[PDB]
């Protein structure tokens with residue numbers, strides 16, 4: 001039904017729409033398979049003189065109407081998400097006899113977590129610190145628009161052919177369903193999300209980077225993370241992590257949310273650490289983290 005939903009709100013879906021003949025969505029070519037997400041290879045015909053390859057995520061036709069909204073609603077968020085360290089949507093061409101569309105630019109290298117784990121790759125201490133700096137830049141931008149991510153993690157970050165990191169979100173709320181291992185104390189306790197709780201999340205992300213994609217707190221259950229922290233615990237210093245960068249992770253996990261540094265100060269602090277390295281140090285994988293989920 002198009003008569004309709006929110007005939008004054010869902011009008012923004014006008015701009016984000018493609019022309020008559022300018023798209024081809026192959027299903028023999030599958031970008032993957034999420035869960036309730038349409039992840040397939042996709043071909044787009046941009047005006048002309050341009051050949052754009054993208055990731056296609058447009059949902060079924062007569063799926064319903066109340067479950068359809070929640071979708072076209074989240075695709076709109078990216079309307080004004082224009083930063084080089086943030087993912088954005090190419091458009092939404094709603095078919096007449098097919099379905100309404102969605103489009104995300106194609107990322108050659110996929111998800112940041114899987115890239116660092118591949119053994120055929122050889123990142124250095126500088127490479128990894130540089131991936132972290134790039135995430136801090138995107139968060140400083142989202143923070144300024146008063147936008148709260150809620151799920152900052154290395155698996156939600158993307159990587160293209162130039163090695164530019166793009167923050168994104170791969171489309172219950174009590175105990176198990178949420179990302180309890182990336183959450184701040186106040187968040188786990190009261191279930192309310194803020195930018196200062198995005199800072200906590202960023203420090204876990206910096207941990208994943210220096211261990212080359214290891215899982216955080218592998219011995220502790222999600223049901224009891226609050227109890228484990230409240231004893232006075234934090235993740236350990238990785239082998240290939242610089243002293244000063246560990247001091248920064250500790251600051252992101254400060255007990256009082258208002259004492260944590262801002263994304264602005266993080267960008268500042270991390271660029272200095274970065275600037276003192278050349279690239280003569282290789283990071284190898286921990287045997288004990290190897291083959292662990």
Ligand SMILES: O=C(Nc1ccc(Oc2ccnc3[nH]ccc23)c(F)c1)c1cccn(-c2ccc(F)cc2)c1=O
Nearest residue numbers: 055057074075087104105106107110167168169170171
């Ligand atoms: O539908 C989203 N995202 C998404 C992310 C990755 C996806 O998979 C690929 C895309 C391109 N190349 C690939 N190669 C292999 C896999 C792959 C993919 F299909 C979709 C999305 C929706 C709404 C809001 N936001 C959003 C953005 C910034 C933000 F900061 C928070 C939320 C999103 O990200």
